Amino acid sequence: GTVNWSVEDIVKGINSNNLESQLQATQAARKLLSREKQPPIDNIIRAGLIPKFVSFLGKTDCSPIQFESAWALTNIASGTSEQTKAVVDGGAIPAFISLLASPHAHISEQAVWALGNIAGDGSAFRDLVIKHGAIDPLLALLAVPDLSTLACGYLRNLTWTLSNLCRNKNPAPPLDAVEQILPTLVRLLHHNDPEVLADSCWAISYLTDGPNERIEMVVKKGVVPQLVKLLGATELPIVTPALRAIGNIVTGTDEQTQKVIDAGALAVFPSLLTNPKTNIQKEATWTMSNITAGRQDQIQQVVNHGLVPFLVGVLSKADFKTQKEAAWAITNYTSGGTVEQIVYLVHCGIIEPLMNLLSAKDTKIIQVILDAISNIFQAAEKLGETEKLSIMIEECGGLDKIEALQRHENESVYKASLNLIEKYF
């Protein structure tokens, strides 16, 4: 009875003075906007209906029309930024925040959903949702002794909308807002539903992507151990955001990185660095490169966990992006590691996998590899075994590579190559 209407019919019903006719027309609009194939969002917008839907959102006496217009506006705001802007310009933000207090959970859920869609457009609409005062009523919906008493979908949508209020940068979410939200995020990170856990890890990942003060807000809440626990989950949808959050925390201070080491993260990296997913391997090797860029006690923690062989394996076979992050890890290890540690590197078999990558077209990776070779040679001088290193590099096909790199279009490549080809070869 409300299926396959026309925008003309929907408009004729919404512009009647019959609340039941308007309810029928708004339901027909919801069903139109609920279709997977080309929902006529732009036709509905041009018809001038968003204002009437927003006005229906305030009809507490007809909760059904509230719910239907909430659903309709949710799906309009789910689209392009211009469409979400139509929704916002109609005055829907304050109305949805008012609906967050509805006695009907199917209506407050839709208000949560619509505000999540609005805040997900970008930082400006996120901050406008926060200025209209959404965080207090949103977190109030989660103020329960046990979260398991709520409904799966309700909690999932609340967690999602909360993660979208932590999302986007330039600017990053307001600090007072992050402080208000984090406590509830920790609870949700300790929930049992994998969807809630995945969106909570995504939220933490957003909050940790920035200056070390943000990383510190998060780390000071004691979440690293739980993120490392979820890093070993069997559901990749949870492992990906968790690995991203841990890798972001490793971009800050050495003390913050130590928090990750102390939590046990390194014991999971044998599997992450052999993971069938290319992006898991890339993220894990990048995080390793930022750990090898830290203190020598942390490089020693890497060594102790048997992860140097896994980095050798990644430089031997992986996506070129993962191989490049591995090369960066090696260069950082050799730049700030002890001599003994560099000798361990060479004893694990780094030379040949590193030299077979001096045939790549990317210039940066060549620079990184050559800097690492230089570091290893310098470490060999302190031991007086640069001839052994030279024989090694020459017996895997390396000297040919460096010699040819002299004749490389780049300049830094040529000069580095030549200094190596002279001081040692």
Partner: peptide, 6 residues
């Protein structure tokens, strides 16, 4: 020796 981003 240099912590880098993605």
């Amino acid at each position: 020796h240099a912590k880098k981003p993605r």
